[model samples]
Structures are given as structure tokens and as C-alpha cells.
Target: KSPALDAVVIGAGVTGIYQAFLINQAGMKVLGIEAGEDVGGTWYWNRYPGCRLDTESYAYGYFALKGIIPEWEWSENFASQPEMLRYVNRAADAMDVRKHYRFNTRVTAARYVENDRLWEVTLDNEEVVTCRFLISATGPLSASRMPDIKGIDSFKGESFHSSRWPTGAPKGVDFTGKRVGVIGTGATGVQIIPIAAETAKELYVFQRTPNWCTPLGNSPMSKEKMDSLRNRYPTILEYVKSTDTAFPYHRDPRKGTDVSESERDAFFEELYRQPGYGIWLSGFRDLLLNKESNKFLADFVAKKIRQRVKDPVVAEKLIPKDHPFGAKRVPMETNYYETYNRDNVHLVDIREAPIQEVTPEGIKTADAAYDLDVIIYATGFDAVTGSLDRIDIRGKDNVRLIDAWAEGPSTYLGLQARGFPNFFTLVGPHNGSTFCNVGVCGGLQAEWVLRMISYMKDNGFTYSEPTQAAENRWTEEVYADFSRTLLAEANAWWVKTRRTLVHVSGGPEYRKRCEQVAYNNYNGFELA
Candidate 1:
């Protein structure tokens, strides 16, 4: 027998939880399914050492729920994993969203029944459910990707991915006198490596591509600042909503490196003190476009790294020369470079000494064999498409979601696809996931979805999807906009084909199309 619901939401993460809450509030019967045993999706899994949020605590929360804004008292400028998880749980409980969630229930497949104009969803446990509306709030960074290395299963000691950290500190397991090997140097790896150094007797940090990380300058939120922000909450919220990035901050780029050497030094120093994204990149206007300007900033960062680390050879290896600054994602660190100076921590340049295999004792590289008790694979996820690909989502004529996206994801404003009527995606591919603020983005999507639902209810529209002409035009617009910038040059996942990843042609164009769409004009969509 199959269950029935007015709406079905996949993944009880930040997006899923909020979406469910809004739908239910509209007097619709909603069911939220999560693969994890809890509501906090990303936070529920990624509990590795030094796992913390890069976004400021104040700017990274939901705004829809009444009385949601409290005088937020954050311990640090950047809160760690525990704090983030606690915040989400509190939000869920306070909003009364926990009751509607089905913990540990993964949606195996969802097929759109053309005749009924409803979706038939199969759960991992073989239970079936039907819903008029289907939503995938599966996060962009949910699927973990461990490297394809030899003898991975042969490793006898305990090893795990950073995303799947064991619940709590492993009892009886000792790393105090153990040799530890950590792979990858992305954001998570950069954060975890320093903390691992403190525990392990000897640590090996495997690096493929070195990342350009700036200091986090994290500190406790001052009472005065918090009180002032609360007083001006409405104004500040309005400002953020209207802003392009949704971050209530901006940096002037008129102050360039072309100025006197003293002035340039002072300008860069001021930007270094500022917190979070765009401050560093926008510090100088030409930094993103001009290679010389970017090189100067990169060199300056490398100089800082060299000064912090005692060994010159290791410092040279750590400085990234492959990609342009801000081409790939920039990481913010607490003491990433300083940790390398510790006697216990060893830096292994994987490009130089490629790993041969994993042995019973430790990893074996072309250079040497380092014995280890624990290994932490800080390898990142497949990103944008990973979470969606995990589930079996089918559209009209039984077209599988994975098969449709095999070439690459295609969507109209990243919200809807042509064949996937009555279905929506939050932070889906072609959306502003790489560039925009997620909290603001989620709110916008929720409002849009709610409006669409209301329209359907009032007008008796059975289903609606984007026209194929609109999808193609949007794609062209996005690609064209990206091509004009240096973002397309680098092999970053945001643009261009690197390795097996396919490139999308439109970014800016699609953004413009979104602005021109019905939501912008208040013209109600017509269902076929």
C-alpha cells in the first residue's frame, strides 16, 4: 500500500526543513524525508576536526519564522560544527518542523505519473508514497568523493572520510602517539590538518593543489555590535536583501596596488583585517581581471606563508601557483600555515610523491612509507550535482534525472525544468550557489514556490513547467556572461570543463532571464 501527501520534500537539510515548514503552513499535507537520522543535513554528517562555518553566524540563518531573530550571541566570528548543528536543531524545534520529518527515510525514486499529474515516490525501505508536488532540497555538497587510490580497502587501521566522522570522539582510540595521514587540501582539509597536528604524534598532509587561504581573524562578537545590529535589524535585513551578494558588507577597489608602495601596503593590510568574502578580491578592482594584479596578491600571500613556516622548502611547496587567486574557492583559516611549523606535522606534496597504495600500516608513496594508526580522507564532494544524483528522480515519459543530467544539468533559472512539472529545486544547478548567499537564496526560492502553489490552488492549474525555448535562452545567457570574465579561464568547477566536468555556457544571461521571468512581472504561469 502507498501513502499519500500533498507535497514530498527530499533531504531534511536547511532548505528541506524550511520548505516543509512553509508548505505545511499553507494548509498542505507535507512529508520531509531525510537519509540522515536528524534534521541538520550537512551538519549532521560533517563533524571532522575543525569543521566550522565560513559564513558569519548572523548572516547565515533563516528569516521566515516569526521571532526568528534573537539577539544572536555567537562565541566566535565563525562558529564550529557543534554550534551550527545546535542552531539548526533549535530552528527546527522552535518552528515546529520536527514533527513532519521522517528521519532515516531516504527517497529511492520519484516518478511523475503523467496520467494522474502526481508523483509516485519509492522509499529505500520499499514503502511508496504519492504527492502532487515534489521538491529536492538535497544540498549541493552532500555526496563525499574519496580518491581512487590503490589498496584502499587493504588498510587495516581505522580510516574514514571527513564527511562521515564517527559520532563523538572515538573512545579507546588513541592518536596521541599515532602517525596520521590526511589527504586533500580543500577547505575542510585546510581546517582539519591543524587540529590533527595537535593530536597526532606525526602527521602527513597530502596536498595535490595548494589553496590560497587567508586568516579568519575570528573573535567573540562584541556586545555593543550585537545590540546595535539588533536595534537596526529591519534596516539591515532590507539592505542585505537588496544587495547583489546578500552579504551586508562591501570593499572599495579604487585603492589599487598601482598607488605608492606604502599606500598599497596599508590598503592590503586593511583588507586583511576585514572578515569574509569579496573583501580581499574586491580590495583592488583589477585583481580578478588583471593577471599582474592577481600575481602581486598571490605573491604577497605566499610571502606571508613562507614567513610563518620555518622550513623554506615546505613553504615553497605550500604556495599555490596553479590557479589564479579567487579562481577556485578561497578558504579562510585560523592557524593553517602556523600549524605546519610544528615539529610533528609533515607536508607531503602529492604532485611530487604520488601515493602508490594504502598499506596495512600506513600509506605508501613513491618516496617513502609512513606508518599510521588513523587516516583522515578530507576529499571533497562531487558538489553541485552529487546530492541530486543520489536519488532516483524521473520526469515525463520515465526520463531518469541522472540520465537527463548526464551531459550536464539544465534548468530554467535553476528552479524548474521543462518536463519536471510541479517539481522545484532549491540551490540546484545553474542557480547562484557558487556566488550568492544561501540564506537569502533559500528565502527567495521559498517565497517563489509558495506563490506558485497559491496560484495553482486558486486557478486549478494541474501542472506547470518551463518552456524549452526559455531553458535554452537562459543557458546561453549564463554562458555568455561567464565568458566575459576571467572566471571561465581557470579550471575551477564554477566555469569551464576541467577533467570529467562539463561546462555550462550561460551564467549572467540566465540571471537576466530570471529577472525577466513571470515572478519579476507578477504574470502568473500557464500550465499545459
Candidate 2:
């Protein structure tokens, strides 16, 4: 029989690769398993047209490897799917993580044997192993979810979900000369629509909820800009550390109340020109807080939509009125509204018309039926807890994780669950981890996991788990913070109910507050 392992990491994405590397660096026998053949978890499979990062290229990478990483001159401020994959590949190679990864394998079950103080992880290939720690680095967006449309499987034509886009080109889907219908006008759908219009003979966008898209004026970064960033990175790095988000954000104190209508208009105009995440991230601080301010910001973008689209009717349909500004993960779009201007592209409000069924020929909405050669479901994943719950994980008393999180996840700091001992969940629910930069949070969380286990091994501690009292207190804190926000009003991912708090990180303060727990010898985590 094979000897017991130190750690088992599920998923070979950016976070998993880094965690595996860190755990191994600390002399732990860590094994990383990925269902995909290659690295870049979400990016690996999501090869749909127009897929790219909304976050800026420079800020998307890990904090530690920034200096050591081989620099690439990015074409645009936001990296494309391929570029980001290459970036991830480079990091994995540099860290020598590829050798430790078991490609094309999925971890099926993780049952913590309380008496043994180890996790018996079962893989799809019938391989079972006992490990001291099971690190779930399976990213929040790892799980790809399709909409519950009737007759979805009955369709005979070619179809693909944005998350599960084919890697190969030979069997790969083609939009040329095809009548394509895309469902879900969220971020992925918005990006896919324009691209589909460019290739397909006809493109129909099925928008369940119209997203308020701000302009992403993606431009080529000048040599001077890169040089400036390279020169003054130290100061910039320090500022980034102190900010609410991981990046050196455009955090201004300008309130909507303080600024006049003219001032707001001028500021909004300036922001419209600049694209990517800034227009909203750097807009009014109280845009999500104050209803009037959110309305003003939403209106500014709505007017822009009307101005961009040639038809007034189309603009109104595209402009989101249901949710307030900064709600439902605002699709930071590049030419999304402008895509509607194209005659080939058509928008269908499925919220009311609603896709009745997927016919063999095409989609049949309640209002009308359209023939199409292809159908793309850009429906997003089940957010934060989905990936974690995908596996059958049980802890003390064989208490299933699925049962524990029936009402949503309750975590001490978005890192680990109370019932699961020595089972670390990186950048997961109940923590402020996902509220800011995911990569930064993942890196920090991975580092903490390494520290935690290494410290345990040295101190002769066999197990560690957060006490029930700690979990309850953290859950309360998370709910209290989110309850007061406009997030409750918006039908956003990561938020199902008012009590279900996925994002525990309220701001810079929360990050420090959680770090303080670590500083005090992993406070709230019970060790044996």
C-alpha cells in the first residue's frame, strides 16, 4: 500500500497550482488533481469567442511572482482568454507544478475519518488515498451551470455552454453562416453577442435580465505607461496593500450629495471614456449605498446606451431598470450596447417571452420561434458554494458538507468550514475573499493554508477546525454587513437570501480584521 500523503489539492487552476507549490515547498507531499487536461481551470475550457478578463492585466497576477514572472507586453489593458491562460501556464511552469498534477482526473469524494485524523479522498478512477489535509482550491466559478430550460436536451442541433467551450478546433463549433441563438445576456453573453454577430448570419441574444453595461474602452498600453508602472511599482504596491480591493483602486471620497448635478455629469463623462472596471469601481463611493446616486449612475449609462444604439426601443430594452447600479455583477462591457446597433444582432427579452423549449431546429420562446444552427448557453455557474458542494465531502460524525450548508455556507473567514477539520477551502464562501481581487485573495489564502499546516506539523498538532461559536459569530458578522447593503435588492450571484453571506470581506477593514486572527496564532480555529 502507498504511504499516507501530507496534502491533496483538488483543481490545478491558478490557486491550486500555487497552493500545491507552496505546500510542497514546505516539504509536504502534495498532489494536485485537475479534471481538465491542462491548467488554467476556468480559462482552460472557456474558449468561447470574446472571452477576456474584465480586470486589468497587471493587477490580475500573483503578488509574489510579479517580479520573477517573465513580462509580456499585453496588447490591451484587459488580457484575453488565451493570454490569461498563457500567463497561468507560465506561472505553473515556473513553480514546477505540472509534474505534481494528475490531469484528466476528478476528485469524487473526501471523507474525513475522525479516528485516523486524515481524509480518505476517492478519485473517479477508483483510487483512494489518505491525506492529512484536503485543500479545495476548486475555484468559485469552476462549476458550469446550464439554465433549466424545457426541451434543452431534446434539441438536435449543435450547442455549447460558454464555460464548457471546446478546446479543439476540428470538432470545435463554427458560427460562420450559422443562425446562432445565445441565452443569458450576463457578462459572458454580452461578450459573446458581438463576436457571434460578426461571424453568424444571424445572432439572437436571449436576455433573462438586462445588465447595465458600462463602456470598457480597452486600449493598447503605451511603453511610457509600462515604464512608469515598472519604475514606481514599490509605492504602488504599498498603496494596493492598503486599499479595499487588492489593486491600487481609484478609491475617491467624492459623494453624490457633495457633488452637484453638473459635477456628477462631468465626472460620469470622464469615466465613460475610460473603460474596464474603473467607470463603476472608481465612480461615486455611495453609488451602491444611496438610491439617488445609484439611479444617477445607472441613468448616465442608460443615456449612453441610447446614444450608442441607433434605435430608441433597442436602448430601452438593453438598459437595465430592474436592479440598481453595481448590482448583479455589472457586465463591464466593451461595445456591448454597440453590438445591438448591428443589424445582424437581435435582442430577445426572455424574462417575459421566456424560452419555452429548444426545438430541433431552434429555440421556441413563448412569443416567437427562431430557427438557428447553434445555441450557446452563457448561463453562469452556481457561484461561490457550488464547486465546493459538487464533491461529496463529509467531516466529523460523517456530517455531509451539503447538509451543513443547507442554508448557505457559514465560515470563520471564508477560508474553511467548522465541521471539516484540516479541510481548507481557498477563496470560498463566508469570507471577504471574493469581494476584492480573486487572484490576490487566493494567493493569500493559499499562503495561510501553508502556514497553518506547517505550524501544525511542527507543533505536533494532529487536527484543526474552527469552533461552532467562532463560525456562528463570523456568520453573524457577514450577514450584518451584507444586510445593510443594496445587494439585498439586486438578484446577484453569491447572494441567495439576506442571511446567506458569501462575501464576508466588507472592505479593507475586514481583510485586516481577519489577518489579525492569524496574527494571534490562528484565533477561533481549535487545534488538537
Candidate 3:
């Protein structure tokens, strides 16, 4: 029986870094485990070309570090993956919390020892560490979900998932003079294809579901601009606390029908011109809920895609048909539609011509087998619950975390599950953070969790977990919220078994709910 650590925080991503920082800052003995060689969980692993933040850099910066780390400035509105990696590391270094983290280490399993009131965390190296608390900061999008295409290993060429891009090539994979096949046209695929097309001799994009992608109009951030932004940090942080999506923008009160046809068109046109998620997050109030308004917006975007692409057929293929606008997570594009117009790039609607298997030479679809030098699977992750389920987590009565969430994950306030005592989640599924700007949302979660832990220690409580009744109520509420939104209609990763993984309730409302629980002396939680 080795000495017990105060806490063991899983993952070293944006949320994990902050989680670890808070743990150590509270003078609590803690260790942060990361699979990567360093920090920046999602950004570190997702080193594929054209990877960058869609969120504004300033807003994404840690609110707690605003005054503390005054010198750092983002070069662009949307910083690239390399810069993001550096930024995460810089934050860790600034906080002097890097020493608290063990890199290149993965938590294989963790089991709660009820008698001892401690957790035995098993690492990849076969080492077991005991901790009083086990916190999962293993972000929603960490676990890459490869497509179930047959004979994947049979491919002769270099093939990799977008998230698991090989580290041997620091400068990135050489696509020059090579035939490349990129499977999946979600966010990752949308970002990768345009850049891959620049150098690849032939680029093929396999699409199953088309996303309503809008332009990511990124701009440079100069010193003067940075200064202005720095001064407005307080104002920015205030809005982050207040807004639904955790961005500065809020939804318009007026619906599409409320405005005249001409007025609505002009508004939609302007939103399209602006960068980021202004069109999706800051547009008309009824764009997401009302069927008519959603279709109107989708039609407008479809028209934009048609105008951008040269071929009418290719443009139509790119336009999404299944879901309404703002229903699903929208991918921000920089010349994504125009990339298909290039002679070198080809679009394969895999829905019409499904991919059968991977051949040694290339991918074989129902239509034809195309020979390619490289294959990039931009297929997304299992999302919110994937990373958590990957681990062998056993709570009371040796109940597996997987078994507990066999139907789907259910958590009280998205922080803790019913049977999982002394186990907390930061930015986990059902949490508002899953939908909000991660920096703002994650910071709030990390801070909230630490405060709860501190309360337990002060009050001489051994462990705390959510009540089963509260967990059930929250789960029902989570689904109820989803049903009210247009998002529930989509068959995306966000929705599983007709249940939405993300909390559809806005961040501000979720934050208030969390505060109310604390104000009520941590109601709905059972503490010993």
C-alpha cells in the first residue's frame, strides 16, 4: 500500500491543465497523466495540416491568467495547432504546474477501493498509484473513431487517422506527387482536404454526411489590436459568463418570419461575410428551433455554396440535406467549397457509393477502386463518452463505468455519476462545457470541482457522490432540453440512441444551476 495522493487527474488537455493547476495550487498532492509527450491534449494529437482553433484566440485564453500572464499575445484571431500547443505548454509553464504532470503516460484503469476510501489508478507502465480522488479531464473529442471499413491494415501506403498523425514528420506528411484519399467530411475532414489538395497530385474526399460549413475569416492580431483586446478582457470575460454558446455574441430575439424577406437576406448575407460561428451562434433566435426559419437559413447557405463552387453538381453534393441549419456542430471553412472546384480535387459521395473496403493499393468503394499513395481518415471520435469508456473504471461494488453508462452516460449536473464516489468529471459529457467555448466552460468546471473538493476536506467528508434520484432527474432534464431543440433531429455523434450527449441548456443557465446547487449546500449530492 503506497502513499495516497490527494488526486489523480486524467488527461493533460486544456481542461486537464487547468484541473491540475487548481489541484496543485490548493496545496493538494496531485499528478496529471497525459498520453502525449506534452500538454495540449486535442491540439497536440491533432497535428494534421490546416488544424487551428475556430474560436477567437483572445476569448479562448484562460480568464484566470488574463492579468497573471500579461505578456502573451495571439498572432492570429484563430491560432494554429502549433501555436495552441505552445500556448497550453506556456500556461502550464507559467503556472509552474508542468512539474506536477507525468507525460507519455496513460491511465489504463482505475478502481475504487471502498474499504480504504482510495482509488487504485493503473498506468500503462503497470504502475499503480493510490489517490483519494480520481478526476477525468479526458476531453470529449480525444478518442478517434476509425471507420469500420474492411481490410484497413491491408493498405500499402501510409494511412493514419487525423488525430493520430505520425510524429516522425514534424513538418507534416509529404503529400506532394502522391494520390491521397481522405475519408469522412466532418469538421476534421473539411479542414484537412483544402490543405492536402494544395500539394497532392490527386486528392479524393469521401463524404457520407455533408456539413453546413461557413467561411472562417481569420485575421491577423497586431500589437495595437492586442492592446485593445487586452483592455476589453474584463468585458469579454463578462460576456463569456453570460452567453449561451460561451462566445461574445448572443442569439437575436427576432425570428426570420418577424423580419421582411429583404431584411432577413441582408442579415444572413452579413453573417456569412463575418468570421467564426456568428452565423450559427449569433443569428436569428428561431434559426435553430423553428423548422421554417432553420430551412430559410440553410437555403441561404446552400445558395452561398452554389455561388462559390464552379460546378453546379459538386455544389449540390456539398449542400447538406438531412439536418437543418444550426442543428449540428457547424464546421468553419476557409475556401473549403472552392477546393472542390480545383481540377486536382475530386468529391466522392460515399453515401451514394459506399466505401466497401481498403485495398493494398487504395480504397475500394461500391463504385470503383481508386489507387492512392496515402489515406487520411478524418473520421471523428466517439465523442463525449468515448475517452471515459476507454478506461476500465470501477466504482462501488466493482461496477464498471461502461456498465453504468451502458444505455448512455447519466450524470448529475454533468459533474458526477450516482455510483461513482470520489470521482468527478471536468468538461465531461452532459456538461455545458461540451457545447460551450471550452476555455471558458472548462475553467468554470475545473474551478467548481476544486471548490467542492475543498469543501469536503474542510468539513471532514471522506467521499461525495451525486444522489441516484438527482442523477435520474438530471438525465431526464438533459434529454428534455435536447428534445426542445432542433439538434435532437440530427443523427450525428452529438446524439446517440436518440439522446443528446451535450447539454443543450445554455452555459449561463447551466452555470446558474451549478451555483444554485452550491448555494443550497451542495444539494442533490450525498457526502459522508
Candidate 4:
């Protein structure tokens, strides 16, 4: 069957749902397609142990709807996976977004038909959709990465990625006397380990590189505090929206370990108590630039690790020495380190005990074998271009998206590419997903796309694509931004494995560029 719409949005997650709503508001018939059975994109797939938003609840939610904001109360500073998923569903219903979404429908292929000036989208069940414009709202972390473990298919027991948690609770869900092995210690692992240790008779946490962790200090929102926040809700939202990082609070960049020893300790202690990502690495400006300043924070974290874990050996192993603090992903947990103290919990440093293979009954390391009933891979997504490149996206002359991104994702402002006319990628590579708040970033991109579409409709233009020169310049600017900082030193997926440098300079440069753009009302694009 073939269907046609004014616009087609892929993925019913945060970006897709909002994009549909905005497009519909523009008097356009928008159809949102989602692979999952429901909306809430990432949250729908990642229903594992303790999935939660690292960003504060208020800052991470939808800003379009004011009613939903007041009705929802975050139990802690950050809500868990289930709470977030429910919140998305609530927003969808309240905003009347669910009506336009086609759940359980996946867009397998999307080709830009140059002659027709439309997108020919093919769904999984042989359904075709032709639309005037194509918007890819697939999030950065939506795709799950399967570990390249030997004998993966031969494993007899139930095995799944954290993103693919069982539909319902496992029958006879008693890990009381069962051995469980979990691989990968990224954000998902940090969240899952504590919960798994609580119930499993013997829990083995496989780790490659230890992640830098800070205490979440999550707690119930006080009635008085809530009341004060509710009163000044608009002001608070505006402050975060205006900020470069979109974090509610700001850190004094001048304050760093370079100050006197006592002053440095006091500053670190105070910021550690605060909520937000900036608290960890932003307060100290030199931390990201100077090696000595970075080492100072690393030593401080090592001291904390030793203080939390009982065994000195375990503590030392867990303290990350290979990578500098914040170079890799930084995680916040409630009682993650303390969870290691549990007698039932076991920490296996994969760097030392390299995983040999997966047996039918369990996993085999270099020296020993671990027996387990269930194996959970907490490895993160391929990130950035992974999900988008996985699917078949053919642009002009049948140019594949994967082949186009073979070297790296090349785009103007991470939104429009040269080959794909009338196509917008939300939260894709070379975008602000690496450093900016995702919800705010996605919302901004959605608004930008809406404005561009309006301009096209008002004029007689049927196509819009970034100029080749503009895309090249933008890609260079992204790389040049990273080259100035220590971020390019790490092998983060953000920089690509080969360190395909993609940085927006530093805080100050980003601010200046943003100011210039704002002053010119986001110039540099040709409407016709």
C-alpha cells in the first residue's frame, strides 16, 4: 500500500513527536512512523534495571506543554526509566501527538526522488510513503550495539541487551541463587549493576575502562522547594534555554584547583553537592585545558574511590587511571560504589581478565569460567550516525547515506546535508548531542526545520540543500573546535574512533559564534 503526506517523520521519540506536532500546526499533514509499539522512542526500548535521565527532571522534559509540567512531579532530582517513559506517554496524549503517529511501523528505506521532489519511504511490511519533506528524528542512542562475543549464538541461556529487556517480568524471576554476568560498564552498566547485585546470588560486573562517577544525591523534592520552583518556573526555564549548555545552573569557570590547596578543596566540595553536569567538570576552567588541573581532579576522584570501596585492591582497580576524568562519559549514581561492597557482588576487570568466549552455561575469561543463568550486555549504542547509517537511505542518484557518511557525517549545522535536499536530521552526528542538552537541542532543531519549511512553502521553492562549500566549511569548523581542547585526545565515539575531530571550539568561542548568529537572525542560508 502507498500513502502520501505533506511530511514524513521517522521515529516517534521526543524529536519525531514534537516535529509532527509543529508541522501539523503549520497546516501540513505530517505522519510519524515508529518501530516500537508506542511512543517514547529511547525510553520504550531501554526498560532495563535503572535507566534514568542524567539531566535534572525539569530541564529534561518537554517545554511546549505547560500543563504537563505542573502535573508531573519528579520523585527525585532525576526520574528512573519507568517514570520517564510514563511521562513521555502522558505528554503524547496531552499534546494530541499520538493520533498522528504510526506505531509498530519502521521506515526501512527512504529515498529522495529528485524528479518528483519527494521522499519515497518504504516501511518494514512493504508499505510505501511518499512525502514532500523527510525528517529523521532517530535519536543518537536509540540503536543497541551487540558485543562481538564468540559463541554468541551458541549461548543457551536467556541473553539480551539492556535496551531489549524482557516484555514482562521474567517468570520465576528469582536471581536469588542464580549467577548473572553483565558486560560493559558505561552509563547503562552503572545503572544496572547496583540493581542486579541487590537480587542476584552472585553478580559479576565485567568492566573494560572504569567510568568517572559522582554521587547523584537524588532525593524526594521538598514541598517548599517545589512550590518556589513552580512559582518561578518560566524564569528558570528561560535561564537554562539561554545558556550555552542548557544546564539550569552555571559554574564559575575561573574557580579551579589552581587556587590555593584549601580553597581548591572547598570549591570542589561545594560544587560536588550541586545538581547538573557542569558541577563535575565545568566549574574549573583549566580542567579541560591544562594537564595538571585535569590530574588534580583525577586524583581527587581516586581518593573518593578508595574511601567508598572496602577493599583497597578493588578500589584501585576501579579508579580509572588510563583516561583523564570527563574525557570519557561521566556517570552519576545514588549508591553505585557502595554496591561494590556487597558480598554477593563481584568486580572483574576485563582489562586484566579478557573475555575469551561465551559458553552455553556462562562466560569464560582468561583465567576462570563464570556460570550464569542470564547475560546482559550493557554496552552502549554505536552513537551519532550509527542508527541513521544502519538503515538504507538513498539520496539523489541513489547515493546511500552510509556511503556518504563513510568518512564521517558531513553536514551544515548538523541539520542539512548537500546531497539530501528537503531532508533534516535531528540529533544526528556533528550536532550538539555531544555537549548540549538533548531535549533542548532537539526542540531547537525542530523549530529551525519548521521555519525552513515555512520559508520554502511561502516561496516557490520545492528543494533545499546545503551548498557543498557551506557543508565543508562547517565540518572544518567542527573539527577545529575539538583540536583546541583535550577532548580530541580521547577515543570517544563523539570524535569517532580515529579521532575524526568534531568540536565546536570551546565555551567562549561557541558563545561568540552563537551571539553572531543570533544577531544576524541565523543567517548563511539561501531561502530560494
Best by lDDT: 3
Between prediction 2 and prediction 4, the one with superior TM-score is: 2
Q: Candidates ranked by TM-score, best first?
A: 3, 2, 4, 1
Winner on TM-score (1 vs 3) = 3
Steric clashes per prediction: 7, 3, 0, 1
Candidate 1 lDDT tens digits, 1-528:
333787888877778888888899999899898888888888778888778877776666644212463644556667788877887788788669989988878787888888888888888849888988888888778889889998888888879898887766533234688888899998999888887787788999989889888887777878787776667667766666554455555445463555776776666667666776644545576666677767767777777788888889988898887877776778889889999889888889888888989999999899999888888898888777777787788999889878886666777777777678778877777775335556665666665677677767776777778777777776665666556555665765444243212223222333444556655432323374
lDDT of 2 by residue, 1-528 (tens): 333888999988778898998888888898898998988887787888888887777766663335546365555678788888888887887788899888999888889887888899999949898888888889888788888988887788788788877655424445778888888888888888876787788988888888878776777888878766666556665665566666546546878878899989998888888766677678777877788888888888888888989989988887777888886777777777788888888889888897888989899988998998888999998887888778998998889998998887888887778789888888778766677677766777787778788788888888889888988988888887777667768777777654554763444676677668877878899989
| Model 1 residue 157 CA deviation in Å | 1.1
The model with the greater lDDT, 1 or 4, is: 4
Error of 2 at 50 (Å): 0.6
Worst 10 residues of 4 by lDDT: 501-510
Cα lDDT, all candidates: 0.74, 0.79, 0.86, 0.76
Model 1, position 491, has a per-residue lDDT of 61
Enumerate residue pairs that collide in model 1.
477-509, 478-506, 478-507, 478-510, 479-505, 479-506, 479-507
Candidate 1 shows a clash count of: 7
- What tens-digit string does per-residue lDDT give for candidate 3 at 136-159? 999988888888989999999989
Give the higher-lDDT candidate: 3 or 4.
3
Poorest lDDT segment (10 consecutive residues) of candidate 1: 498-507
Deviation in Å, model 2, residue 12 alpha carbon: 1.3
Model 2 collision count:
3
lDDT score, residue 214, model 2? 77
* Candidate 3 overall lDDT versus native: 0.86
lDDT (C-alpha) at residue 276 in model 3: 84
> lDDT tens string, model 4, 69-174?
4666666678787787878887788668888988887888888887888898889849788998889998887788888879987788788888888864533335
